Amino acid sequence: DIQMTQSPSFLSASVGDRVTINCKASQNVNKYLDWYQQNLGEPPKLLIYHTNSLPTGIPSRFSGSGSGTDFTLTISSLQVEDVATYFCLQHDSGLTFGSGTKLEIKRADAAPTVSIFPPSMEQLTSGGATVVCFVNNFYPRDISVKWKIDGSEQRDGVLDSVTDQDSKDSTYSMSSTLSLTKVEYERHNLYTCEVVHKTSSSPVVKSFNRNE
Amino acid sequence: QVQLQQSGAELVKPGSSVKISCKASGYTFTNYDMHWIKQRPGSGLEWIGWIYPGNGNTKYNQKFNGKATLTADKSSTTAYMQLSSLTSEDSAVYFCVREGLGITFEYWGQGVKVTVSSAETTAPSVYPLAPGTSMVTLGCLVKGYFPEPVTVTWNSGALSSGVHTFPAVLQSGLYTLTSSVTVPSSTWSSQAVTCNVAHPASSTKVDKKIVP
């Protein structure tokens, strides 16, 4: 099959910016390259077909260019409804989609609100234990959440989940969970949720003690 | 307008099969090729194959040969895809898409989410997330349910602004999500805060008041 390398995977832009997305093909695919736009919970939407043709209804600020192996989609002046994921598609020999480019909107930095929650009383009676840490309303998107147990890094049993960019304030929120057996949870005292983010010179820390 | 209406979502046990339908309307069904597309995190967008309803001719991606079988019925203007030998790797959203004339994927179906799992219906455990240690963040933990989705509210919708509900994570064939809410300190002490969790698959609706 023909491989498609899309770049960048993530693109931050402001309304009114000239935005460029790149797609490269491992083999010459001539003019048969399209660009598609996808919003959350919806099928892809044809933006550009045949390297540079605009489907009827597509605003003129979208344009495309290519060479056979190197292709570029351009938004001349970014508007809000252009915040989406973008995919390239070659249909010269077989069909291959690019991995995608996620386009977000820029805003001023926002330090996250960090909150940590011990296993509930009702869960400890169930025989399990889950520690929860919320990291809400932060920007930029690049962030790291770590867990420490008794002042020591914990990697086993951690799972993270991140919201899509908020349409009202352009921030992100994140939930982290630390899964443990109740037996293991009761072998320790200090539980720490540690957040590394652009907004602080050192990691943000929120902790609790199992012994209150 | 061209319209492509796809069948309903699917929940299949592993090793079985499923037949997804694509109802076409608004044009001459036998004058356009119809493709099928798989979308899944990691794999991304993959082309499965096409079928020409005019004579029943089909072409398949080598990676989906044996997996998918494309059919169409002229008199019903409906396209079918049969997915065989279902595994967890086939859990994805499947689109039918029409190839235009002198133009490519202009009209799509809405997609059919196929979920392949051997897990049986499990109502969630709803645990309160309370401050274990001037704006207060609370939450609740929806752990170990199947299948998706659940519907999380706060005070049956009376709280909405500062509410974050995070995407579920799948660990050991069971889903788990969290939801947080931020209210004033005065509201925390004066009014009641309850997260309502509904799971229609198990016909379960639980309310959990967040007590200190």
Place this chain on the structure above:
Amino acid sequence: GPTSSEQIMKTGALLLQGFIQDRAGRMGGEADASTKKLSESLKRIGDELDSNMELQRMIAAVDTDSPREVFFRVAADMFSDGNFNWGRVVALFYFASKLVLKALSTKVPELIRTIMGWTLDFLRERLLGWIQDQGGWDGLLSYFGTGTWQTVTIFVAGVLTASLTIW
């Protein structure tokens, strides 16, 4: 040579394959120079015929329950009067491709060789002598220079019109 039956029957099968489509689209693709100018000129006229909606409405109204009977009845009607011309040959190729696009088969890859076989069978039994009288397949190439793309399209469509309006 270009007028040998081996060559005439060889160039003709290369034309059919390049002209007869088995689908409506082209996405993903399917994976001599004087022959190339013929393959392309046939394509240009095919799309010109494809864009004559009078012709398409009458083509769509053709019964195809028995594809074999329909093909030989229509091909024979096109050449029964004994006054062959290249426009009728083009109309034979076009009608062959329309059959492929409108006749079902659980193994369509076989129905295409089958319909291609019918056309070559009819060509050999009925037209082979006339084609070599024309200097070979070069007659069709020089025929595309005696008129514009509309002169040929309107004529070829009239040939199809007369043969699909009775059979």
